[PDB]
Ligand binder design. Structure first.
Ligand code: TUM
Ligand code: TUM
Ligand code: BOG
Ligand code: BOG
Ligand code: PLM
Ligand code: PLM
Ligand code: PLM
Ligand code: PLM
Lengths: 307, 307
């Protein structure tokens, strides 16, 4: 009854603290190791984020099996990023090719097995109980590729300022945790592990950044966001929960297209939009705070789209 | 049934967005007004925080009557701060006298009326259902004064860096909202109004601060934290939920006492402890992030102390 949900809440809160402890303790141990590889701050810090998620989620896999596809996707997107950052020490079309392979294997898992429904919950209709479920069948795979690539690139573009991607993703992952518990899905310990792991990293990533994510990180988290929403039948919530991610890709699409259509004219001071505000006179910290506060308000708005 | 809690969650989420909209829109309107009074950034910005709380909570007073004592206490502590900051443009023992009067009227409300129980829930015992309730009767009033003054001064000492008090209090107020809903207390719209109001202010208070709280703010929020916990029978949770507030007063008590006991020796580089880390080489933003992440982890630990 209430005990079922209580034990789940207690196991999820525990997953957050477990991943927070791992991530916070690995950072001072792995930070000189990453700086030795480099020799403006050491990159490839996404390995700390992933290491923490993998360790925590491995204890929950026997009890919560729906974690496995989510874990495989973030680790899969983390592979492309690990290879990308390895080239960076020792491409846009190559990155899109790598992202295309992982999305395909995930599309295969969703259509062949019957663990989760392919339908999409419409936001302000009446929740999972009442509501309305969008289905297109034939267009399921093209729609998956388009939103998964959009989310992954959107998250990658967000990783431009200290604490930016981390702060925004903590709030997105917190929303998925509250929803995964309340709606009784099976991915709350991994969504929670991402919250804990990112809170640990944020201590060392906040201005002035001691470490940098990724690419190794940013692609992994972008996979997590898209995979979780697909595991919960909520891809239609990504434009609202991840409006920051959406506005980051969209500002680049508008800048690059408009620049070429004109004589090199600019629609923004610089793209992605976080560079635009900086050039407007906004502090690195202002941009990080405004983007996070906006995400928080929109996560609450999204939640009201489940009643 | 579930509808009762659902409507409460929807009314509370609404209170957050309402207070966020008021606070975010008042700031660019009241910021030149406060700078005109001053002529390193304009102070007395706590009036924006309070204005937003009062407007939002006034719509919920007929449905949620338990808001009235909480509202009266923060407005009461906001009065002392408004007078303090007025003197600042045109004291420690005078501040302690003002705080003593408001605490007394609140002590009178708690003992004379039977709206709430005087007992204190012990953290890791078994929650409100099972658990253990600490009672001392005669010592209720002295214990109230000691924790209320400690909390109020602790919150006041936290307001030293850009976004510091705001970030930490958002997390403390979020915890009280989740708890006030789940445990069916009657103060969730005001605890939520504080979350919304502070999220609006944080946009303009984050480094480099456009406005400053208080004193007008800091004392008001310190009253809110102590009053909410008393309305919920959770004062014993303030050392864990507000460990940052506790460590801020405690570091001053240790520095001031040790300095006098010795030949002017220092136990910390500077007190409160936020100045200590800055002098250790920590960024203004690092201190704000570390203190907020710690509060978040401890709020989760505190929650596990309700099962
Ligand atoms: C338009 C486009 O596709 N490129 C983007 C896009 O390109 C990616 O650049 C990334 C670099 C970015 O991580 C830099 O930002 C800095 N950084 C990072 C974290 C942090 O916490 N703090 C910090 O300062 C730090 O200097 C770091 O080198 C990376 O090369 C991607 O491969 C690249 N993706 C693609 O274009 C695809 O994202 C960038 C960052 O937002 C944008 O500047 C850039 O315009
Ligand atoms: C020991 C003690 O009691 N005093 C404290 C205590 O004193 C209070 O000082 C406050 C001032 C503080 O608000 C300053 O911090 C700055 N500030 C504020 C917000 C912000 O967002 N950013 C920012 O930079 C900005 O310069 C501002 O003048 C105030 O005078 C209280 O009356 C005072 N309380 C008591 O001693 C009682 O708190 C201080 C701030 O933490 C400590 O420096 C000081 O040591
Ligand atoms: C501190 C964060 C706690 C996460 C809140 C998750 C809410 C889980 O709470 C559950 O929600 C269900 C409806 O959603 C109800 O049917 C259950 O009775 C209730 O226990
Ligand atoms: C997004 C934040 C939502 C706040 C979560 C509050 C949890 C309210 O959820 C309620 O909790 C009670 C036990 O606590 C249960 O008995 C109820 O059935 C459940 O609806
Ligand atoms: C209030 C909480 C504060 C916690 C204090 C922890 C201090 C640890 C400092 C670690 C420094 C490591 C330097 C690596 C670069
Ligand atoms: C850096 C600024 C971040 C501010 C943190 C805001 C925390 C508020 C909690 C809202 C979580 C969103 C889930 C709603 C359901
Ligand atoms: C992604 C969300 C960004 C929201 C953009 C809002 C821009 C408003 C800027 C207000 C500037 C007011 C200056 C007062 C000092
Ligand atoms: C500036 C950094 C703030 C980070 C925001 C962390 C949000 C996590 C949400 C935890 C809320 C605590 C309530 C637990 C029950």
């Amino acid at each position: 009854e209430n005990l079922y949900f209580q034990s789940m809440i207690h196991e999820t809160i525990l997953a957050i603290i477990i991943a927070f402890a791992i991530s916070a303790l690995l950072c001072p141990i792995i930070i000189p190791f990453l700086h030795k590889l480099k020799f403006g701050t050491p990159t490839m810090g996404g390995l700390i984020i992933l290491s923490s998620i993998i360790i925590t989620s491995v204890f929950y896999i026997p009890s919560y099996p729906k974690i496995i596809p989510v874990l495989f996707v973030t680790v899969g997107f983390g592979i492309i990023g690990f290879l990308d950052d390895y080239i960076k020490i020792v491409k846009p079309m190559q990155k899109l090719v790598g992202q295309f392979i992982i999305t395909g294997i995930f599309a295969w898992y969703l259509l062949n097995s019957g663990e989760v429904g392919t339908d999409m919950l419409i936001p302000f209709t009446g929740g999972f109980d009442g509501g309305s479920f969008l289905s297109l069948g034939i267009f399921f795979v093209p729609a998956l590729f388009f939103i998964m690539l959009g989310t992954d690139n959107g998250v990658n573009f967000t990783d431009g300022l200290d604490g930016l991607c981390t702060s925004v993703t903590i709030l997105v992952a917190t929303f998925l945790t509250i929803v995964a518990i309340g709606e009784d899905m099976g991915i709350s310990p991994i969504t929670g592990a991402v919250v804990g792991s990112l809170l640990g990293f944020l201590l060392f990533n906040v201005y002035p950044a001691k470490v940098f994510m990724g690419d190794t990180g940013s692609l992994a988290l972008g996979g997590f966001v898209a995979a979780s929403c697909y595991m919960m039948r909520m891809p239609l919530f990504i434009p609202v929960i991840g409006l920051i991610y959406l506005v980051e890709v969209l500002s680049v699409i508008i800048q690059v297209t408009y620049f070429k259509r004109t004589g090199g004219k600019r629609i923004f001071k610089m793209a992605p939009i976080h560079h635009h505000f900086e050039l407007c006179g906004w502090s690195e910290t202002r941009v990080v705070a405004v983007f996070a506060i906006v995400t928080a308000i929109l996560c609450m708005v999204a939640y009201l789209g489940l009643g």
